[PDB]
Amino acid sequence: AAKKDYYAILGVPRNATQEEIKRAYKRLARQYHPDVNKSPEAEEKFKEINEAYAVLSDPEKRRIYDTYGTTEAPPPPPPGGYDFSGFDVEDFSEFFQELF
């Protein structure tokens, strides 16, 4: 329900560029990816990192996230829904499911 802080998960400011987001994700993926790190702690952290990246790496989805909780009126969801190809979305947080 409460707004997750995807910027804190990746270690970047709210005003980060998409390039900065990409490089922060890559730094973390090099550490927590399944076949480099087989620990359960790595699995759970990487889940969080992937959801954060799923949202923040697509500028259009990032905008929806950034506007969440503000006093600005929200945009009606677009035709067909959203597209999170290359992400394990069915297992993402209830905040994510609610937001998108």
Residue numbers in the entry: 2 to 101
What do the paper's sentences say?
DnaJ protects the cell from adverse conditions through the prevention of protein aggregation or by assisting the refolding of unfolded proteins and is an essential partner of the chaperone DnaK in bacterial DnaK–DnaJ–GrpE chaperone systems. DnaJ, the bacterial homologue of Hsp40, stimulates ATP hydrolysis by DnaK (Hsp70) and thus mediates capture of substrate protein, but is also known to possess chaperone activity of its own. T. thermophilus DnaJ is a typical type II DnaJ, i.e. it lacks the zinc-finger domains found in type I DnaJs such as that of E. coli. Crystal structures of the complete molecular cochaperone DnaJ from Thermus thermophilus comprising the J, GF and C-terminal domains and of the J and GF domains alone showed an ordered GF domain interacting with the J domain.
Based on limited proteolysis of a DnaK–DnaJ–DafA complex, we first designed a construct containing the first 114 amino acids (DnaJ114), comprising the J and GF domains, and determined its structure to 1.64 Å resolution by radiation-damage-induced phasing from a mercury(II) chloride derivative. After the Pro6 motif, the GF domain folds onto one side of the J domain in a spiral, making extensive hydrophobic interactions, mainly via the conserved phenylalanine residues. Only two hydrogen bonds are formed between the J and the GF domains: from the Tyr69 hydroxyl group to the side chain of Glu99 and between the side chains of Glu52 and Ser94. In correspondence with the NMR observations for the partially disordered E. coli DnaJ GF domain, the T. thermophilus DnaJ GF domain binds to helix III of the J domain opposite helix II. The same interaction is seen in all six independent copies of the J/GF domains in the DnaJ114 structure. In the DnaJ114 structure, no electron density was observed for residues 108–114 connecting the GF and the C-terminal domains in the complete protein.
